[PDB]
Design a protein around this ligand. Sequence first.
Ligand SMILES: C=C[C@H](C[C@@H]1CCNC1=O)NC(=O)[C@H](CC(C)C)NC(=O)c1cc2c(OC)cccc2[nH]1
Ligand SMILES: C=C[C@H](C[C@@H]1CCNC1=O)NC(=O)[C@H](CC(C)C)NC(=O)c1cc2c(OC)cccc2[nH]1
Lengths: 303, 305
Amino acid sequence: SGFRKMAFPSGKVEGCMVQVTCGTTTLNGLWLDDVVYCPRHVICTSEDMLNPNYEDLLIRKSNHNFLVQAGNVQLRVIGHSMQNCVLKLKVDTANPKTPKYKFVRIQPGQTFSVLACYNGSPSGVYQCAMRPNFTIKGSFLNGSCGSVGFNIDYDCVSFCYMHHMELPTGVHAGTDLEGNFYGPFVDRQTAQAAGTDTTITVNVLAWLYAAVINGDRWFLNRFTTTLNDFNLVAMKYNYEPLTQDHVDILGPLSAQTGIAVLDMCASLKELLQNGMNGRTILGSALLEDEFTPFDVVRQCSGV
Amino acid sequence: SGFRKMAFPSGKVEGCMVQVTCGTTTLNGLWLDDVVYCPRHVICTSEDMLNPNYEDLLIRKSNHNFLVQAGNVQLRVIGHSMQNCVLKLKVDTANPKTPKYKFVRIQPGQTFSVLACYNGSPSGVYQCAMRPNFTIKGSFLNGSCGSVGFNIDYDCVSFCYMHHMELPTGVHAGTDLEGNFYGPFVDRQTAQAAGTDTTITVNVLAWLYAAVINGDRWFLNRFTTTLNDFNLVAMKYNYEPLTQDHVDILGPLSAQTGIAVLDMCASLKELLQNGMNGRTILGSALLEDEFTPFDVVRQCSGVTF
Ligand SMILES: C=C[C@H](C[C@@H]1CCNC1=O)NC(=O)[C@H](CC(C)C)NC(=O)c1cc2c(OC)cccc2[nH]1
Ligand SMILES: C=C[C@H](C[C@@H]1CCNC1=O)NC(=O)[C@H](CC(C)C)NC(=O)c1cc2c(OC)cccc2[nH]1
């Protein structure tokens, strides 16, 4: 029993992290086969940061302008290209620890594990959900760029996030491994705002089922609601609309607990309208929306 | 910026996880040099667990009754012994992935990363605080025993927890790597209850230091207190008393902010005696008690390993 926010084991990714230096700038890179992937803003100076013409800055660089260190070993850069906001440095050595991997673009509401790194060395691991406004609520300091987010299915690492920026609000923004930002953000040194954030309703519901599966039922009620009437109330409170696909994805949790999805929607509606009134759910005083139905099924099936 | 519960990178420990089977009972073990450590109840059948005599169960076992596997690769057992509630199995191969390590027994309030494992295969990693009642709020399913908890210092992995049991309340209990349970529990299939839990004062203070570092300091008052007086008051609110070691490990955060530990204690006392009103601290109306002083430094300074 028990429900906890947990990240995938990070070993397979730790073996890929390297340090990439250009000029006075050092950050992290991801070393897969004979290519190192890192944020392209590593090539920018203090002055270039405001409005960098990256193609113009990159053409002026040589392979020897990039220092790549894997532990104590320096990797010789034999080629450099740019795919959107990701710099790709070809090295003369293939990473022997390269796992089975793929590059994927994650959808809002889905979760992934972040391996926060500094100077090419792992520092910590934590789960983040891609928010509807395409930010993530992570923990990143100076030099964390190039840290990656991933999921692990079987032994295949699906990389979905590379870290680039912290917004003034303290949330974080980045790209996929094709270098395309999640959200309307740009890799320039400017204060940038995200769109109005919304709450991931299907995840809140999964988290309520988790609370029930772990013995917490105080928030349930004898009422039910139609999907549309629930969505009317949800949107009033800046919650994302619930789709029939979301309802279906919640089926397994509904079958395990015997609580129809629309019955749990009526509980959430009551919570949004009455609040929690000092009560807590799984130790939280707020409604948590960073747990997917899959994250709940993975931990609570059979309990 | 950002404050998150963050596990240690788990790679060094993943490379030490193996499967240990006795009969049909399989759980996890920890392979370090040429020894595998696992819970001793792996030698118990389902019926034996109700009331086991481990010394007697073990005398009937031989090296050849133990199946240790790294994946599907068998490691031959060439010696066995019981140390408290931990079985030690000597194997004929030294783990080439063995990291620098030590075995430590942690105090209540200290945190560690749990590498949840099933059949010797790592499933997930999460942070746990040892509660004052010597349970942890983990997430564990059948077959999870032998999963370990650890901290990383520089490059040394300090193992401090091995998982053994789930209490009726849904919390979890286990041992250090010398097989000594945390708390008054035993490895027997019996309904066991943990004492009343309490809030971890030193970690709440750390969380308050974290708030100050980030500019959230409305709760600072112009009072101080003695350690004894604060301890007596705190217990009335179900808070743990502070030890000298607690004061010591708050030293760095005290120096960084310039707020003496006993001054922060007086501020916390007022929050307990007056509440927080509708105000929040670091965005929360609840005081957090599962971040140690080091956890705060980790988050705000970016330590690597
Ligand atoms: C090492 C990788 C860091 C990650 C950051 C560091 C602290 N924590 C992290 O996550 N990335 C960067 O430093 C980026 C670099 C750009 C060229 C993409 N820039 C920003 O994140 C940033 C600039 C800025 C601003 O500039 C006027 C105003 C207000 C907020 C601002 N944020
Ligand atoms: C694989 C390792 C599991 C961890 C468990 C499995 C599910 N989640 C986990 O954490 N460990 C075990 O199965 C232990 C076995 C030893 C005590 C011999 N037994 C219990 O955990 C247990 C016995 C019991 C009880 O006995 C009458 C009453 C009420 C609650 C109870 N729990």
